[PDB]
Amino acid sequence: TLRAAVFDLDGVLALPAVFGVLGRTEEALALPRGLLNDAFQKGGPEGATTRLMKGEITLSQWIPLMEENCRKCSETAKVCLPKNFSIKEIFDKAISARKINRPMLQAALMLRKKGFTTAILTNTWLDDRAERDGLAQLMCELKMHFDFLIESCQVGMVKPEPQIYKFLLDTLKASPSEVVFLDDIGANLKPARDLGMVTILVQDTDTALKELEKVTGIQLLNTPAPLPTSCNPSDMSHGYVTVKPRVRLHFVELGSGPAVCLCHGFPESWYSWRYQIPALAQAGYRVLAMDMKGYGESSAPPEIEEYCMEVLCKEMVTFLDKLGLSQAVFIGHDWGGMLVWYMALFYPERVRAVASLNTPFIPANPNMSPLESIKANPVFDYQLYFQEPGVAEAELEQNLSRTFKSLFRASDESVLSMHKVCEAGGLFVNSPEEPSLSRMVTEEEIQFYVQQFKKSGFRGPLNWYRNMERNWKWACKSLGRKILIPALMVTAEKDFVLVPQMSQHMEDWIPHLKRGHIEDCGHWTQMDKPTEVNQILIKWLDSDAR
Amino acid sequence: TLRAAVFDLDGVLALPAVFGVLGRTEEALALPRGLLNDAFQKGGPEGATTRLMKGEITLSQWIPLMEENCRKCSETAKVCLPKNFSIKEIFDKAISARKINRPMLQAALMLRKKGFTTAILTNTWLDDRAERDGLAQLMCELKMHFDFLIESCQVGMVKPEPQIYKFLLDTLKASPSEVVFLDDIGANLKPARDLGMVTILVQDTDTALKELEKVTGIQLLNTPAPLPTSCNPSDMSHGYVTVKPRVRLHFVELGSGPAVCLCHGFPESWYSWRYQIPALAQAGYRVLAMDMKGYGESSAPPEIEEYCMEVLCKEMVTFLDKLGLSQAVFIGHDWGGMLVWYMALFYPERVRAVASLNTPFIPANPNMSPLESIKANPVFDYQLYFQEPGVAEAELEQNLSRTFKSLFRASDESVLSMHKVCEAGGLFVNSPEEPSLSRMVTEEEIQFYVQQFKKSGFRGPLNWYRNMERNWKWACKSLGRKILIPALMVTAEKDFVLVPQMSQHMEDWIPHLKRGHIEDCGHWTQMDKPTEVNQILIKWLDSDAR
Ligand SMILES: Nc1nnc(-c2cccs2)s1
C-alpha cells in the first residue's frame, strides 16, 4: 500500500525532454546519428556530463568540455562539422522549449491531495548561463507543489547509482514497497525495482497515468477540471506598514514585476484572493493582497469617520509611498471595488490601472440625498440595517461560524434574501443556526475567517457603510472628471445586489472601459468562479497594465 | 522667529519651470509672443486652466480645452497654426524635462534638520496621461522630505486666492510671522506678505538661498556635502517569512523593480544598510534588507549547526521561493559577503548578480585545516576567541551600549587592535567603559542596535563563526567550480581584518570580476563612506544587473 509518489523532471513533469533535442538537431542538420549523443556521454561516469550532473562543474564550464567531445566524436565520425554552430545555442533553445506537462502535474497534485507524499528526483546541473532565469522560474513553479525536490547537483549523486535511491527512501521516510517511481529512462528505473519500489516507464503521458491510477486506485485521468492553486496563510510573506500613528496595514506579498494591489470587500480578508494571488504571481506580477482597514491584522480604530472614502484613499496613497511604489494596478471587489474607482478618480497618477469585480462605478447624485438614492431600491436595504451602531455587530458577532457559512454561498445555495432585512430585523432571522457548508468553501477556510474576525469584530468593517453623507460630499468634487486610465469592469450574472444592469451607464465616465462577464456567478466572484476571474484579469493585465 | 519654511514646486524645487516651456516653444516655432501663453490663461478664474488646478477636471480633459484656446488666441493672433503640432507633445516633453533642484532640496533638508517645519504648497493638476509615472516618481521622491505637501487639485483652492494661505497656516499650526515662503511667481507671493509671512522671490537658486539663510540664520549655501537619506525604522515596510517551522526571517522592503537582497555581517542589522536602501530604491530597484538568522526580529535558534553556511544558504533559497522570486541580486558585507559568494557558487540560477563589500571570496584549502589556515595569520585571532560558547556572549552582552560604541568606529578612531584578543582574553580589555561616540554614528543609532540585541543576544550571531569544520567540507564540493555570473568585489583601504590584498587571487575563480575601491574606509563600509558605496553599487547594478 503506497503513500509516496516520485517523478522525474525531464520527460515526466517537463516536456519535451532534452534527450529528443540532440536527436532532432542531428536530423535537421543531417549529422551522423547519435554523433551529438556520443559527445554528451563520452567517458560515461568519469566524463564531463557526469561531473556536471554531480555539481562538480557548472553548465558554462561544461559547454567547452562537450564542445571538446564534438572534436573527436566527429574525428571518429569522419564527418565535417558546420560553423554558425553553437552547443550553447542548441541547449539554450531546448531548455526554452521545455514547458510543464500539466496533466502530469495535475496527477501529482491529486495524489498529494489524497495524503500521498510527492517528490521530484532529477539529474540536473548548476546553471550559470545569462538565460538561467527561464529554468529557475520553471523550478520555482514546480517545487512548491511537492514535498521534496532532490537534485543530483545538490546531493552529488546521480541516477542510476544506487545510493541516490537509498537517499530518496531516507528523505521520504518510507519503505520501497510504499513508493511509486515514474521515469522516462529504463536504466534509471531498474535500481528502484531492485529495492522493490513500484515503477512506471513514462513513454506517453496518458498510458503512464493509466498505470499510475490502476496501481494507486485514485482517479487521475479524465478528472473534473481542478481548482487553481490556493494560498496556505502560514506559508505567505506577511507585510506590515504604519500609514499613521494609530493605523497599521497588513498585507500578503507574492511574486515579482509590476505591483498589483488587491482590495477585498465586506466582510472579507486578503484571503478572499487566495486563488488569484499565485495565478497573478505566476503571470509575472507582484501581488499585494491587503487586509483593508478594520480587518484581520490591520488596525481597526473605533471612530466611524476613520472609514470615510477620503480617509481610506489617503491611507492607500501613504501605503504606496511607504513601500516606495509610484504606482500600483488596483483590483477591487465589493467595497474594495468602490474604493478602487475613487483611487482612479482622485489619484490617477498613483494608479497604473483599475479593475472592479461586481462593483459598478457609482457617480454621486447631486440634488438627491444618498439616503433617498439608497432608499429608491429594495436591494440596498441591508445598508440601512448597518446604519445604527451595535445592532448589526451584535447579530454578526454572536456566532462567527454561522455568520460566514450563511454569507459565503454560491447563487443556488443562498439562505438569505437581503430584503425585508430591516423588516425581518435581521440578516439571519430566516437562517438555520447550523448552516450547511457551501461547495465554494471548506470547514478549514471558514475557521480562518472566524480566527480573523475574533480579533477586531465587525465594527470597523460596518463603519465603511456609515459614511454615506461624507462620501457623497467628497464624490461631488469628481462630478466634472472622467476616468481615462485603463479600467476593467467585471460583472457576475447571479449577483442580486451588485446587478450587471447597474453598470450599463459606466461608459459615460469611463469611455475606454473594458468589460468581463461571468455567468452563474454570485456575489463572491473570487471563490465562486476562480478559473474565469484569473483568465479575465491576466488577459486584461497583459494587454493594459504591461 | 521662524520655525516653518514653505516652497513652491515649479521653478523652486523643480527646474526648469514649465512657464519657460510655452515661451521657449514660441521662440523655436516662431509664433507671436505670449500667444501660447494667452491660450493657457484664457478666462482666468472661470477658464479651463483654473478648473484643472482646482481638481475640477483632469489633465487629459484639459488638453482639448487648451487646444480650444489656440483656435481663438490665433484667430485673434491672425497667425497661421502648424500641423504635426500637439499641445500634449509639448507638455509631455516639458514635464519629462523637469528635474529636482538638488541645492534647493538640500536647503529644505537642512532647515528640517534644525527643527523647521517644511511644506510644499503647489498649483498642480490630476494627471491621467499614459506617461503620468514620471511626475508621480518625482513627487514620491520629493514629498518624503517634507512635513506636508499641499496640492491645489486636492484642496480645491488655488494660488493666489487668500483661502489657501489661511489653509496652509492651519496645516502648519503656525502664525504668519513664523513662516518663510518661497515662490518664483510675484502674484502668488503678495497674499503671503499681506498675512505678514516672510517671503522670497525665487529667480535664481543661489540668490534665493542667500536671502533664505540670512533671514533663517542657518548655513544653507556652501555647506559640506550632505549624508545620503537614511531610514527611519518606524516608517519602513516590515516583512516576515517562515522559512521552516522554527525559523522566521524578518526583512525591510523599499522600492520597485529587480529584487536586490542586502546581507549584513557581524554583529549588524538590516539597519546597517540605512544609507543604501533609499538610494537603491530611488535608482529603480526593489530592496529587501534582511535581518539574517540569529539577528533582530528574525528567529535565533540556540543550536550551532543551525548557522552553518549550507543551512543558511538553503534558508535564503526558501525565502526567495516563499516571496515568489526566481532571482535576486545578492549584496553582502562581512559574513553576509561570505554567504553571498556561496549563494553564487551553489545556487547560480537563483542569483541575478553577486556583490561583496570587504569580504573576499575565500576558496576552501583542501589539505589544510581551517584551524591551521585561520591560525596562519594574527588578524583572524578574534575568530578563536569566538570558538568556545559563552565567553564572547558574556563579554559582548555585559554592556550593549559599550559593545556598539567600541565596535562602530572609523579607522582613525579605533579603540581595539583585534590581535592578542585571546592573549588579552577580551575584545574590550584595552577599552574605555564609556567609549566616545564615533562620527559615523548617532546616540539614537546606537540605541537602535542596543534595542535589537536585547531580544536574542550574541549567541546566534557568534554561531556563524562556530561552523568552521562543516563550512570547510561543504566548500570542498565547489573546488572545481567557477563564478561566471556578474560579480563585484568592493575593497576598503583601511579594513585591517578584511584587507584588500586578500582579494588579489579572486580573478582565478571569478574571471569577469569587476572591482570597486574605497579609500580611507574601515570595516564598516556602509556607514563610513555611504556616498561612494551608493555610487559604486548603483553604477554596477545599472550596467550588470539590468
Ligand atoms: N452606505 C453607502 N453606500 N454607498 C456608499 C457610497 C460611497 C461612495 C460612493 S457610493 S456609502
Ligand SMILES: Nc1nnc(-c2cccs2)s1
Ligand atoms: N570561523 C570561520 N571563519 N571562516 C569561515 C569560513 C566559512 C566558509 C568559508 S570561510 S568559518
